[PDB]
From Swiss-Prot, chain A:
Lineage, opening ranks: Viruses, Riboviria, Orthornavirae, Pisuviricota, Pisoniviricetes
Name of the protein this chain belongs to: Spike protein S1
Complete-protein stretch covered: 580 to 620 of 1273
Designated gene of the protein: S
Organism: Severe acute respiratory syndrome coronavirus 2
Domain of life: Viruses
Binding partners and assembly: Binds to host ACE2. RBD also interacts with the N-linked glycan on 'Asn-90' of ACE2. Cleavage of S generates a polybasic C-terminal sequence on S1 that binds to host Neuropilin-1 (NRP1) and Neuropilin-2 (NRP2) receptors. Interacts with host integrin alpha-5/beta-1 (ITGA5:ITGB1) and with ACE2 in complex with integrin alpha-5/beta-1 (ITGA5:ITGB1). May interact via cytoplasmic c-terminus with M protein. May interact (via N-terminus) with host bilirubin and biliverdin, thereby preventing antibody binding to the SARS-CoV-2 spike NTD via an allosteric mechanism.
Function: Attaches the virion to the cell membrane by interacting with host receptor, initiating the infection. The major receptor is host ACE2. When S2/S2' has been cleaved, binding to the receptor triggers direct fusion at the cell membrane. When S2/S2' has not been cleaved, binding to the receptor results in internalization of the virus by endocytosis using host TFRC and GRM2 and leading to fusion of the virion membrane with the host endosomal membrane. Alternatively, may use NRP1/NRP2 and integrin as entry receptors.
Impact noted for substituting Q34H: In strain: A23.1
Glycosylation sites: N24, N37
């Protein structure tokens, strides 16, 4: 096209953890993503 | 840290719970 060379990065991917303090205490569930940023959630 | 030298297609390093700062 114009030969403006380009870089490739494996697009943000990662595991998910869950923040939950026990069914007895409550049921609110929060989510954690590790190998990514909030910009591309 | 400087003595030693410096997202891999399905295999990842996880962060430590204990960052170098907290360490």
């Amino acid at each position: 096209q114009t030969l403006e060379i380009l870089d490739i990065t494996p697009c943000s991917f990662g595991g998910v953890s869950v923040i939950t303090p026990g069914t007895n205490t409550s049921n609110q569930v929060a989510v954690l993503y590790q190998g990514v940023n909030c910009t591309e959630v | 840290f400087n003595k030693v030298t410096l997202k891999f297609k399905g295999l990842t390093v996880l962060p430590p719970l204990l960052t170098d700062e907290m360490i």
